[PDB]
């Protein structure tokens, strides 16, 4: 059929030219039913037409069409556990979005797509319904009603084919979980393929690190319940007999470094095969070949196994590649942070040969700051150069600083409140400013802190701090005296070994003392400082302004921060007053902790802690009684009331502030007092020595599935505190508090784990050696921050 003209009926958005173009048929050509059908199918395939009809009028080829209504909006109702924006992102990734049209036959398809998304997020009983609201001008809105349903949780994780290790002991090291008590923070009970693969790798490693070279995971099975609210996992394995490590043999283009390697491949012939050690050998060889310039030194380890004698022999293939040089290092995504903040963390220098280990070190260092959510690397090449590359770090900035508030309870500090506002990246500079405050039963503390972590390129820091501190003693199991102090401090920090860290700084502190109970150990200092207050009254005030030089050293080698199993921590702090200050004294403290394991799985440990301290005056003066040392409590010596170990107060005969019988008073004249007066309330001492030997064991009655999160210990604690300036000749009848032989011992049990309320630590101790005046407190616990 010859066509002399073309006409359309229904073209609203698509122009007439677009239609005339897409059509195989054009004006002035012969047409048949086949070409008409082709045109109709093309119009349908354009994705903008719902119904098409190409008929023949008297002379004209008339095209009727009902354009698919243009989508004007996409609403949602019932996306509790799914964000509207993410759902819309998934939708517009599927194809449907605003501006486009609505295919009136793909409704169930989109419903099933969203259902599949829900199936992927965990929910399997979800129902999606797409309602369609027509509107004039051939527009339509698409509403999506979601019935989420109830999530599916794991009810069991089983492992079959294991005979040497119980299944619980293996699940204990998984990221998935089947049991989640209400008194522990061990994880959720959800299912994800990534976690499953990670757990399979953890299992494979747990076996390969024990000699089971032939270990093989036959298959995995995931199953549901007919109600689709429970998930079951099954893992079949085949653990083969243990294998020994007979020897090692290297071969490849070692680059003449065959000498420096054979010392890295030294073993005791007849060792138990292990995968971690093999990977460590490979990484060491790679680090060496990087030290010699090579950037991509491939290393492969192939084991030749012999079952007749059960001997493994490793075959290491080394392929040291070519040297690559770095021309640039770029950072994109740092809209707030400056380039220096990201560059000073790079261990790979621009303008030098390349090392991938250094690039990874830089990436990790950038991850630690906390200013970036994601950190990706890309080593692009250079157009027209086979030995040059440009490194790129893509970063996504995060909300830098936080508003932190937290509570806790405990026997020592009663109820403890904390509140602070912190900022870690002040205008993208690295400065960390903050305002913090704490409040407990016996002190308020408020500090304003600032610090530049790079006052020098190497990593030296420079701090700064203003602080206000109110301290009541009667609330701390001591003699009565109130100290309100304010001051400022500045300190530098020098890192030297990646474990050791020195620090040195200056400080000014103003102290005001008031509401002081007459007792000898106070006068011994007041007199020294020229004062001559009275004994028969406690309206006594004393102000001092002191300048101090503070020094310190720290050593940290613990394998872990939480529940360590091997290493040692050490801290030395010191202070000395420099001339000009009213007070003349020096003070020193030394804390030490040492964890020593006695097994291979690190479940039996021997912990040893010590705490030494000594201070004294210089110009015939004494040390301030508000800088003294205190022992007793859940940190030094357990089983004793906090801050009761050591010297006691020797009161004077003195009227009281306001007398009211039925209240216990400490030797007031209004009760028949005419001479000095022993007491049982502590005052502290200028010298202190504390030790603790603890034995950590596994929790015996709790399931092995999550018994690795609870720490059980049996401890033996010792301590003593004493005053060196107590003149035992003048005050004869009362004991000699300058005798360090008065050692206080205790022994008992302790538990420690993590709870939603916060960290928990319980302890029951029974002091068997204690002296007159020491108050016992067997049960002690510290739910929360402190």
């Amino acid at each position: 059929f010859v066509v002399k003209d073309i006409h359309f009926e229904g073209l609203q958005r698509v122009a007439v030219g677009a239609a005339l173009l897409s059509m195989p048929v054009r004006t002035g050509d012969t047409v048949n039913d086949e070409d008409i059908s082709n045109t109709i199918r093309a119009l349908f395939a354009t994705g903008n037409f719902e119904d098409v009809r190409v008929l023949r009028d008297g002379d004209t080829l008339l095209v009727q069409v009902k354009e698919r209504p243009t989508i004007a909006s996409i609403t949602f109702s019932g996306n509790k556990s799914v964000k509207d924006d993410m759902l819309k992102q998934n939708l517009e990734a599927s194809g449907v979005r605003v501006g486009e049209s609505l295919d009136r036959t793909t409704i169930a398809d989109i419903e099933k797509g969203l259902e599949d998304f829900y199936y992927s997020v965990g929910k399997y009983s979800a129902s999606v319904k797409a309602v369609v609201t027509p509107l004039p001008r051939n527009r339509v809105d698409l509403k999506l009603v979601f019935q989420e349903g109830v999530s599916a949780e794991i009810q069991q994780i089983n492992i079959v084919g294991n005979h040497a290790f119980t299944t619980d002991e293996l699940i204990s090291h998984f990221q998935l979980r089947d049991e989640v008590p209400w008194w522990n923070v061990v994880g959720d009970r959800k299912y994800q393929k990534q976690k499953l693969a990670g757990d399979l790798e953890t299992l494979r490693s747990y076996y390969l690190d024990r000699g089971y070279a032939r270990f093989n995971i036959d298959s995995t099975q995931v199953s549901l319940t007919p109600d689709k609210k429970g998930i079951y996992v099954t893992v079949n394995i085949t653990e083969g007999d243990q294998y020994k490590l007979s020897g090692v043999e290297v071969s490849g283009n070692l680059a003449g470094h065959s000498a420096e390697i054979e010392q890295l491949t030294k073993i005791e012939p007849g060792e138990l095969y292990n995968g971690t050690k093999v990977t460590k050998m490979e990484d060491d060889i790679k680090k060496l070949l990087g030290r010699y310039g090579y950037a991509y030194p491939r290393v492969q380890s192939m084991p030749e196994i012999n079952d007749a004698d059960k001997t493994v022999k490793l075959r290491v293939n080394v392929d040291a590649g070519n040297r690559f040089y770095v021309r640039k290092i770029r950072f994109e995504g740092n809209d707030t942070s400056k380039d220096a903040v990201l560059r000073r963390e790079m261990r790979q220098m621009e303008g030098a040969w390349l090392g991938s280990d250094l690039v990874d070190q830089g990436k990790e260092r950038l991850n630690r700051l906390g200013f970036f959510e994601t950190v990706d690397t890309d080593t692009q090449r250079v157009p027209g150069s086979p030995d040059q590359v440009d490194v790129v770090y893509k970063v996504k900035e995060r909300n830098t600083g936080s508003f932190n508030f937290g509570i806790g309870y405990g026997t020592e500090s009663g109820v403890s409140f904390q509140a602070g506002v912190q900022q870690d990246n002040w205008l993208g500079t690295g400065y960390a400013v903050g305002i913090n405050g704490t409040k407990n039963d016996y002190q308020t503390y408020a500090e304003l802190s600032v610090t530049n972590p790079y006052f020098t390129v190497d990593g030296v820091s420079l701090g700064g701090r203003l602080f206000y501190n109110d301290f009541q003693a009667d609330d701390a199991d001591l003699s009565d005296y109130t100290n309100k102090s304010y001051g400022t401090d500045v300190t530098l920090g020098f890192p030297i070994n990646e474990y050791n860290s020195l620090r040195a700084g200056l400080g000014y502190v103003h102290n005001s003392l008031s509401n002081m109970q007459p007792q000898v150990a106070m006068w011994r200092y007041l007199y020294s400082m020229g004062e001559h207050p009275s004994t028969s009254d406690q309206d006594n005030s004393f102000k001092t302004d002191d300048f101090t030089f503070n020094y310190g050293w720290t050593y940290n080698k613990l394998d872990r921060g939480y529940f360590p199993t091997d290493g040692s921590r050490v801290n030395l702090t010191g202070k000395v007053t420099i001339p000009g200050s009213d007070n003349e004294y020096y003070k020193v403290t030394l804390d030490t902790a040492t964890y020593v394991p006695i097994d291979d799985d690190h479940k039996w440990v021997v912990l040893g802690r010590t705490r030494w301290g000594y201070g004294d005056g210089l110009g015939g003066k004494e040390m301030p009684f508000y800088e003294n040392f205190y022992a007793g409590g859940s940190s030094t010596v357990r089983g004793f009331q906090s801050n009761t170990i050591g010297p006691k107060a020797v009161y004077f005969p003195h009227q009281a502030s306001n007398y009211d019988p039925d209240y216990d008073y400490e030797c007031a004249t209004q009760d028949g007092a005419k001479d000095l007066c022993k007491s049982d309330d502590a005052v502290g001492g200028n010298a202190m020595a504390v030790a603790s030997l603890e034995f950590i064991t596994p929790t015996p009655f709790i399931s092995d599935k999550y018994a690795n999160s609870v720490r059980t210990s049996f401890f033996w604690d010792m301590g003593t505190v004493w005053d060196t300036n107590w003149d035992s000749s003048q005050y004869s009848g009362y004991p000699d508090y300058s005798d360090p032989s008065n050692i206080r011992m205790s022994a008992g049990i302790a538990l420690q784990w993590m709870s939603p309320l916060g960290p928990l630590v319980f302890s029951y101790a029974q002091p068997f050696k204690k002296y007159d005046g020491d108050k016992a407190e067997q049960f002690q616990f510290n739910i929360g921050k402190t």
């Binding site: 600083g401 936080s402 932190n404 508030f405 937290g406 904390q418 309320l757 916060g758 921050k785």
Partner: peptide, 10 residues
């Protein structure tokens, strides 16, 4: 440990 009631990265 320190913030057992809200570390709020504002």
């Amino acid at each position: 440990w320190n913030s057992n009631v809200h570390s709020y990265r504002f």
